[PDB]
Amino acid sequence: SGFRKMAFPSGKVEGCMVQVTCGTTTLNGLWLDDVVYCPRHVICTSEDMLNPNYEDLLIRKSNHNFLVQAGNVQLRVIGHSMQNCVLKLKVDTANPKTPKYKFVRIQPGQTFSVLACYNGSPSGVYQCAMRPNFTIKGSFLNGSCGSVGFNIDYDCVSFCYMHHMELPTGVHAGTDLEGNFYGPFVDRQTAQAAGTDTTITVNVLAWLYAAVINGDRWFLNRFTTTLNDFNLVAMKYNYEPLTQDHVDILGPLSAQTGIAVLDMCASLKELLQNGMNGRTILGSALLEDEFTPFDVVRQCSGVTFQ
Amino acid sequence: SGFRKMAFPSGKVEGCMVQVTCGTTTLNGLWLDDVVYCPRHVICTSEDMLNPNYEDLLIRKSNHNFLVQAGNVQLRVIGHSMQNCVLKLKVDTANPKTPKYKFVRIQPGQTFSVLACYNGSPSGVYQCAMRPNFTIKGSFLNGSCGSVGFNIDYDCVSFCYMHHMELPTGVHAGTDLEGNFYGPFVDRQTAQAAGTDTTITVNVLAWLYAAVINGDRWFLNRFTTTLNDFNLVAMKYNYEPLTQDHVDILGPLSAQTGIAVLDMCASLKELLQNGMNGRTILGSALLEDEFTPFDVVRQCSGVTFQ
């Protein structure tokens, strides 16, 4: 028993992280087969970032302007191309540590692990969620750009996030591994608005089911409610509306605990309207939304990977 | 910027985890050089756990009674030995993945990462603190025994914990890698009292400095206090007393932020007596005590490892 915000084991990803240097700028890249992936702004100076013309900047760079280092091995760069906001550097050596991998674009509300890196070397791993407004609330310092987010499925690493920048508000924005930003952001140093952010309701419900499984039951109430009645309340507190698809995904947790989804919703509605009044749930004084239904099932059934 | 409960990258430990089955009992072991370390209660049935005589039980077990397995590699057990509460199963093959490592016994209030494993296969990684009462609040299901806790000292893995049991109260107990329990616990299925748990005050202060580094300043106040007046309030709220050694440890954070340690303590005094009244610190509505002063420095300065 017990319940923790758990990250995926990072070993398969650690063997893919390299250091990419172009001119003065150094950041992290991801080396899979014979291609290194990194944020295109590796080719920018600090002044360039205010207003970069990436095509004009890239034309002034040749294959030998890129220093790629995997530990104490330099890799030789044999071609380079820009794909949206990522650079693809073809190198002469295929990574012998390349795991089975996929590139995936995740949806808001999904969770993933981030391996925070500096100079191509790992610093730490943590779990977070893609917010409904397409930002993430990470922990990133200068030089962490190119750090990647990932999930693991048995033997397969699914890469879903590459870090590109910190907004003036202190939240983080990045791309999938095809170089397309999550959200309306662009890779330039200018004020950029994120959307209003909302709480991920299906995740909160999953977490309440985790709490029941672990013995926290005090919030279970007599009442019930309807989907429209609940969504009317959730919108008043900036919660995402719940759909039938969300109810379907919660089915297994309903079966395991014997608590119908709409009953669990009526408990939540009362927590929203009256608060927690100094009590806690799974050790927390706030309603938690960074666990998906699949995360709860994984942690409560003990799933493992290759 | 940002602050997350970050674990150490787990890659160096993942290549050391094996499955150890003895009779019907299956748990995790740790394979370093040609020795597999695992909880000695792997030799017990569920009935044996009520009242085991480990020396008599171990006598009736031979080398061929231990099935050791690492992916699809069978290991041949050459010898066996019991060191306190750990079983040392010595094998014919030395682990080619053996990292640079050390065994260390940690002190209460120190933090480490746990690599949660089932059947010798890594499931997830999370950071926790050794509580002042020598339990950990982990996340562990049946068959997670033998999962290990560790820190990374630059190039060296420091192993400090191996999981042995879940107490009737849902908290977790285990040993160092020499087999000596942390706390007053024994490896048998009987009710065992953990001490009163206290909040790790030096860690709370470190996290308040993290909050200042990251822009949360609202709790900073006008006042100051003596180490006695503070320790007097702290004991009222089941906080660990603060010593001069703790003040010394916090020096670098004081210097970085320009806030004297005693001034931070005066801030903490006020939060305890008047609560937080519905606002948060670093996204949390409770005072956090699972970051050490060194964890904060690591995360706020971007330390990496081999």
Swiss-Prot record, chains A, B:
- Per the Swiss-Prot or TrEMBL record, the active site comprises H41 (for 3cl-pro activity), C145 (nucleophile)
Its name, as the record gives it, is 3C-like proteinase nsp5
Subunit-structure text = 3CL-PRO exists as monomer and homodimer. Only the homodimer shows catalytic activity. Interacts with host FBXO22; this interaction promotes the proteasomal degradation of nsp5.
Species = Severe acute respiratory syndrome coronavirus 2
Q: Where is this cross-link: Glycyl lysine isopeptide (Lys-Gly) (interchain with G-Cter in ubiquitin)?
A: K5, K90
* Intervals, Cytoplasmic compartment: 1-306
Q: Per its Swiss-Prot or TrEMBL record, what regulates the activity?
A: Inhibited by pyridone-containing alpha-ketoamides compounds 13a and 13b. In turn, alpha-ketoamide 13b (tert-butyl (1-((S)-1-(((S)-4-(benzylamino)-3,4-dioxo-1-((S)-2-oxopyrrolidin-3-yl)butan-2-yl)amino)-3-cyclopropyl-1-oxopropan-2-yl)-2-oxo-1,2-dihydropyridin-3-yl)carbamate) inhibits SARS-CoV-2 replication in human lung cells. Inhibited ex vivo by michael acceptor inhibitor N3. Inhibited ex vivo by compound 11a and 11b.
From the entire protein, which fragment is shown? 3264 to 3569 of 7096
Q: Where in the cell is it found?
A: Host cytoplasm; Host Golgi apparatus; Host nucleus
Q: Which reaction does it catalyse?
A: TSAVLQ-|-SGFRK-NH2 and SGVTFQ-|-GKFKK the two peptides corresponding to the two self-cleavage sites of the SARS 3C-like proteinase are the two most reactive peptide substrates. The enzyme exhibits a strong preference for substrates containing Gln at P1 position and Leu at P2 position
Function of this protein? Answer: Cleaves the C-terminus of replicase polyprotein at 11 sites. Recognizes substrates containing the core sequence [ILMVF]-Q-|-[SGACN]. Cleaves and inactivates human TRMT1, preventing tRNA guanine(26)-dimethylation of tRNAs. May cleave human NLRP1 in lung epithelial cells, thereby activating the NLRP1 inflammasome pathway. May cleave human GSDMD, triggering alternative GSDME-mediated epithelial cell death upon activation of the NLRP1 inflammasome, which may enhance the release interleukins 1B, 6, 16 and 18. Also able to bind an ADP-ribose-1''-phosphate (ADRP).
Q: Source organism's superkingdom? A: Viruses
**Record domain Peptidase C30: where:** 1-306
